[PDB]
């Protein structure tokens, strides 16, 4: 019922999620568990099956290791089911222990579990007011090699049991046959196979539909969120069509992707998916500046918050970043033969800060490992008495007591190079995190400002890592102290609302008769009015109403960017969340594909067209750059584009640079969208 609840799969940011590789976690069951060449018994090739299944994490729910921590959300591996052979690259033998070499959507990977075990970690999930959070990854179902059949499972695609395709044969086309990518471009690296893994070709309509289906499957069980696998390497359109397709059904739900960044930087792809896809982000640059800041100290505080900042300026749904800081494809943040301290203050940092905190498993107990299968070990110990476990337990529940952590704006109170005071603020709660990473020195705070009420605040830890209390006078003034060394302390207040704010509104992106859900505080007991701009809607189009949470109709109004605001029984209006991209409605995918387009150096051809989803005739808006190399070869460009279905599209191309803006020649080009099915249309400049 309320925003906090553990039936909104939609908004996540009251949240923490605890990241489970499922087979190193916990062996519940030793009955599924691979024989022979597929299982590691002695835990020497971290390539094989250790044996963790849903049982294991079923148990570590009941006795209370994972409740204890005050984590709310279940991030495990990809469920469905995975090749079962080994395949040997370089000598050493490799198996699907990782989820990602798919075989069956619509089947369970058996080393994990049957469908009843599913059902049975939903629910002891659900009962525990734990999120559920699957890995999905529709890029590429398994290693293959067109000329070897006989190499792995020639990357085989099975519908429930059925055989649908293999790489090998490929006569419907399920796949992409144009080779392995050099990830040189972002075009490369999505229409071309992942090393080996054999791309699936989401333009094949059986394909769209298959997924479709099975995504439907996994969340008809009550599956809460997706982490969507290399979003990078799949196209745009697709995903924004296929997430649309999600919010437009029965279960929508929290969706984010991963787009991977390496240290230092920035994407305008990266962003640009953040903000127009339809789905979230794990978020990299945090990621990466935080493990430079604490675990290799090549930062320091104030590039911390200078990427606060930017990251700030460049996402338009801030608090549906997915923070870490560390990985399964990461070093572990944990060094061997370093103080424990760092991780526990990227801990604090992570889970006071914007965004949605997901946390590694076995970072609470300091697991170390380099690399791809290092980083990946059996999970250590279930000691719950680490300092980072306490300090998790400690720091998540705030997420959901108090609203400035989970809807909050971040503000700098004091920096240093070793020391980080920031504040997060909503309405009239408010939440003071203060960090020193110098392990020698301890530094006096200052002239300090805050927006905390007068009064003494108490460490939210309790001293756990060397925090202090504070006094506050008027004027949100806080009284001289000293931040000890390698010292991190928490303060808080929390207020009754008594003025509608909107904290977060999900989903981002939706065609008129979905149901959107909007957190906040104040909202009253009584139905009153959502806006859409300046479009209302009533009692009718109002789902549900509570204090904290609305649930309501997207009204037939104008697709395109909307502030979404809300006006209580009263008539008292609330903050508006900015940018709401409204569907002109249900959207297929659409193939533009334009020939004998001609352009120097530096121009390129873009599209437009008479609805939001081609930019409305704006050539500012305009769909592109479209490509020009693998689907088809310059001068002829193609573009993977979510477009409404059953829609009569009128379009031009346009060719932008400089920004000397061409336009097509004499009368617009005229399409049909199909109703449900993806299409491709074929036109000439
Ligand atoms: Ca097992
Ligand atoms: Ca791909």
Do not use: C
């Not at 599913?118 to 890995?135: E, G, M, S």
């Not at 787009?259 to 305008?268: E, F």
């Not at 997060?424 to 006096?444: M, Q, T």
Request: charged share 15%.
């Amino acid at each position: 019922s309320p925003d906090t609840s553990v039936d909104n799969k939609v908004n996540f940011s009251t949240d923490v999620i605890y990241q489970i590789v499922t087979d190193r976690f916990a062996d519940g069951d030793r009955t599924n568990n691979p024989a022979g060449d597929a299982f590691s018994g002695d835990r020497s090739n971290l390539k094989l099956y250790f044996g963790g299944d849903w049982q294991g994490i079923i148990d570590k729910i009941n006795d209370g290791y994972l409740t204890g921590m005050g984590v709310t959300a279940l991030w495990i591996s990809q469920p469905v089911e995975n090749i079962t052979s080994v395949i040997k690259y370089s000598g050493v033998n490799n198996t699907s222990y990782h989820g990602y070499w798919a075989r069956d959507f619509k089947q369970t990977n058996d080393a994990f579990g049957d469908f009843a075990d599913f059902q049975n970690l939903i629910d002891t999930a659900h009962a525990h007011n734990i999120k559920v959070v699957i890995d999905f990854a529709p890029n590429h179902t398994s290693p293959a090699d067109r000329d070897n059949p006989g190499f792995a499972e020639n990357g085989a695609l099975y519908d429930n049991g059925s055989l649908l395709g293999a790489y090998s044969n490929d006569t419907a086309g399920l796949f992409h046959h144009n080779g392995g990518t050099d990830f040189s471009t972002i075009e490369d690296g999505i229409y071309k196979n992942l090393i080996d893994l054999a791309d699936i070709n989401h333009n094949n309509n059986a394909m769209d539909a298959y997924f479709k289906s099975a995504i439907d499957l996994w969340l008809g069980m009550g599956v809460d969120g997706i982490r969507f696998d290399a979003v990078k390497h799949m196209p745009f359109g697709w995903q924004k069509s296929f997430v649309s397709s999600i919010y437009g059904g029965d279960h929508p739900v929290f969706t984010f992707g991963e787009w991977y960044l390496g240290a230092d930087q920035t994407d305008g792809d990266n962003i640009k998916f953040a903000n127009e896809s339809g789905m979230n982000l794990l978020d990299f640059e945090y990621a990466q500046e935080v493990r430079e800041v604490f675990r290799d100290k090549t930062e320091t505080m104030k590039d911390l918050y200078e990427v606060l900042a930017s990251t700030e300026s460049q996402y338009d749904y801030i608090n549906n970043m997915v923070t870490f800081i560390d990985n399964h494809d990461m070093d572990r943040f944990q060094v061997a033969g370093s103080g424990t301290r760092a991780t526990e203050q990227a801990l604090a940092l992570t889970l006071t800060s914007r965004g949605v905190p997901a946390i590694y498993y076995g970072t609470e107990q300091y697991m170390t490992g380099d690399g791809d299968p290092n980083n990946r070990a059996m999970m250590t110990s279930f000691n719950t008495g680490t300092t980072a476990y306490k300090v998790i337990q400690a720091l998540a529940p705030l997420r959901k007591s108090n609203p400035a952590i989970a809807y909050g704006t971040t503000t700098e109170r004091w920096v240093n190079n070793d020391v980080l005071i920031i504040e997060r603020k909503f309405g009239s709660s408010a939440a003071l995190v203060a960090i020193n990473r110098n392990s020698s020195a301890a530094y006096p705070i200052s002239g300090l400002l805050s927006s905390l009420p007068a009064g003494t605040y108490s460490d939210v830890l309790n001293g756990l890592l060397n925090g202090n209390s504070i006094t506050v006078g008027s004027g949100g003034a806080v009284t001289n102290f000293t931040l000890a060394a390698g010292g991190t302390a928490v303060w808080q207040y929390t207020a009754p609302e008594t003025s509608p704010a909107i904290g977060n509104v999900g989903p981002t992106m939706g065609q008129p008769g979905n149901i959107v859900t909007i957190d906040g505080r104040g909202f009253g007991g009584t139905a009153g009015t959502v806006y859409f701009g300046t479009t209302a809607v009533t009692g009718s189009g109002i789902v549900s109403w509570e204090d904290t949470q609305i649930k309501a109709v997207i009204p037939k109004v104008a697709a395109g960017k909307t502030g979404v605001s809300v006006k209580t029984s009263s008539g008292t209006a609330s903050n508006t969340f900015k940018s709401f991209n409204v569907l002109t409605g249900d959207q297929v995918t659409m193939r533009f594909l334009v020939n004998q387009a001609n352009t120097n150096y530096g121009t390129n051809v873009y599209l437009v067209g008479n609805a939001a989803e081609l930019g409305s005739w704006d050539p500012n808006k305009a769909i592109g750059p479209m490509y020009n190399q693998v689907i088809a070869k310059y001068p002829s460009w193609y573009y993977d584009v979510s477009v409404p279905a059953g829609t009569k599209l009128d379009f031009k191309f346009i060719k932008k640079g400089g920004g000397t803006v061409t336009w097509e020649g004499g009368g617009n080009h005229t399409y049909t969208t199909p109703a449900s099915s993806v299409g491709t249309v074929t036109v000439d400049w």
